[PDB]
Amino acid sequence: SHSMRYFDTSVSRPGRGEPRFISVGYVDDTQFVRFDSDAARMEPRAPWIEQEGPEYWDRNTRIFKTNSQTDRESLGNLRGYYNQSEAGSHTLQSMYGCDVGSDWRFLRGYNQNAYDGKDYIALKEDLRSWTAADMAAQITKHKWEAAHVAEQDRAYLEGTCVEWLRRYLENGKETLQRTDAPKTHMTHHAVSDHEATLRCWALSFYPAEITLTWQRDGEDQTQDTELVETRPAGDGTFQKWAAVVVPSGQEQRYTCHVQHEGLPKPLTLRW
Amino acid sequence: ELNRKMIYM
Amino acid sequence: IQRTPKIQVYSRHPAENGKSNFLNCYVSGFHPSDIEVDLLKNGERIEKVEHSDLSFSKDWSFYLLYYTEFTPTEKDEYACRVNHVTLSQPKIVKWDRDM
């Protein structure tokens, strides 16, 4: 299981400015490419993408720019469907890509668009039909159905998308086909004479997916637990922690469990 | 490798 | 839809005084993507600050990482100012070595 994803953002800066256009490319949890309309061409975020020729950089840059022009026209159309003013700043997001299974063969494809934080239209799991969120989206769906664009999107997601994911997985194997098992440890913080907080720490792991669960005398605990969002360290690894409020003098009764792809057997942490 | 979007919303 | 940022201030490696490390401010879950972030050493903005490329999560909310190299000292206080259209005033989140 591996994935390739593009996250695209288009912000209509009004009156003074052309829109802003961003596209970020990800293999699993590793950024490998960036396109930015306001950058002083393509800037490689990964060494193995730089191994690709200058033709790759110029083609993708042309594609990005064509997409920019398409988003710009879409932003204007969206402004019109909803009868909004050209003086407003609006946001148009896109996220697409493909997943592969253990055989590096096509498993899933997805292509979703959001307008101003709200799901606008998305390709179905079958990559055959579309899902609209309101009447404007219904117009897009009818336009897109009339043009048969779900065919091209499926083609790309089952074809080009998978082929290039495989190529990057082989070419950047040392960065992408690796796992860094989490280094764990436990902190303690008194709340009062008879309540305390245990915090279970996971540091420097990769991929980002992890499961941190607390146990009281071996039983699962979700009451009085807090689980923060996984965060990047900057060095290509991730951090995460989970906390539980315990009675003072019962800290030893609680254990933390860490499940991770780099762990054949889950880790157990005691205080 | 980017996909090319050919159709306006 | 508008969404207030969540902020996490932390170090790249366990803070041990005297060794060079990296101060991270990770802002996430916000929307629209326009946002202003500063890293503070005892109140004073640091100049040499970088930041990652604009991305977003499964619920379409944006996230950024702002980082800078430094050397942890037991006297200096580090923090993070974040302004956003959802905030009436800039939010200051102090660093916490335990956090």
Task: Give the list of residues 6+ apart from residue C47 with CB closer than 8 angstroms, or none.
Answer: none
Whether the ω angle into residue C32 lies within 30 degrees of 0, i.e. cis, is yes
Pick from A139, A156, A158 the residue to mutate for testing the B interface (most B CBs within 10 Å): A156
Identify the residue whose tokens are 């994803």: A5
Is the separation of the CB atoms in A202 and C1 below 8 Å? no
- Structural domains of chain C, count: 1
| Residues paired with A173 in a beta bridge | none
For chain A, the domains span 2-176, 183-270
A86 is written with which tokens?
A: 């050209």
Distance CA C92, CA C96 (A): 12
Distance CA A198, CA A98 (A): 39
Contact (CB<8Å) A152/B1: no
| Residues paired with A202 in a beta bridge | A184, A240
Experimental method: X-ray
**Distance of alpha carbon A25 from its chain centroid, rounded?**
10
φ/ψ of A105, rounded to 5, equals -110, 160
Chains that touch B (3 or more CB pairs under 8 A): A
Q: What is the resolution of this structure in A?
A: 2.7
At CA A240, angle to CA C21 and CA A205, rounded to 5? 75
Distance CA C73, CA C95 (A): 12
Amino acid, res. A149: V
Distance CA A92, CA A121 (A): 11
Task: Give the list of residues 6+ apart from residue C67 with CB closer than 8 angstroms, or none.
Answer: A234, C12, C22, C23, C24, C25, C49, C50, C51
Neighbours of A176 (CB within 10 A): 21
Chains that touch C (3 or more CB pairs under 8 A): A
With beta carbons under 8 A apart, name residues in chain C contacting A25: none
Is the separation of the CB atoms in A178 and A206 below 8 Å? yes
Pick the CATH number of A2-176 from 3.30.500.10, 3.40.50.300, 1.20.1260.10, 2.130.10.10: 3.30.500.10
Given its phi and psi angles, is residue C67 left (phi above 0), alpha (psi -120 to 50 degrees) or beta? beta
A5 is written with which tokens?
A: 């994803």
> Which 8-state DSSP code applies to residue B7?
S
CATH 3.40.50.1860 fits A183-270, yes or no: no
Distance CA A11, CA A77 (A): 14
State which residues form the domain around C35: 1-99
Given its phi and psi angles, is residue A29 left (phi above 0), alpha (psi -120 to 50 degrees) or beta? alpha
**Distance of alpha carbon A35 from its chain centroid, rounded?**
16
The three-state DSSP-derived secondary structure of chain C is: CCECCEEEEEECCCCCCCCCEEEEEEEEEEECCCCEEEEEECCEECCCCEECCCEECCCCCEEEEEEEEECCCCCCCEEEEEECCCCCCCEEEECCCCC
Q: Please state, in angstroms and as integers, the Cα–Cα distance from residue A142 to each residue in A79, A138, A149, following that order.
A: 18, 6, 11
Sheet hosting strand C36-41, strand order edge to edge: C44-45, C36-41, C78-83, C91-94
The three-state DSSP-derived secondary structure of chain A is: CEEEEEEEEEECCCCCCCCEEEEEEEECCEEEEEEECCCCCCEECCHHHHCCCHHHHHHHHHHHHHHHHHHHHHHHHHHHHCCCCCCCCCEEEEEEEEEECCCCCEEEEEEEEEECCEEEEEECCCCCCEEECCHHHHHHHHHHHHHCHHHHHHHHHHCHHHHHHHHHHHHCHHHHCCCECCEEEEEEEEEECCEEEEEEEEEEEECCCEEEEEEECCEEECCCEEECCCEECCCCCEEEEEEEEECCCCHHHEEEEEEECCCCCCEEEEC
Q: What is chain B's Cα-based Rg?
A: 8
Contact (CB<8Å) B5/A113: no
Pick from A10, A43, A95 the residue to mutate for testing the C interface (most C CBs within 10 Å): A95
Distance CA A247, CA A253 (A): 10
Neighbours of A80 (CB within 10 A): 12
Nearest to A78 among B2, B7, B9 (CB): B9
At CA C57, angle to CA A202 and CA C48, rounded to 5? 70
φ/ψ of A137, rounded to 5, equals -50, -35
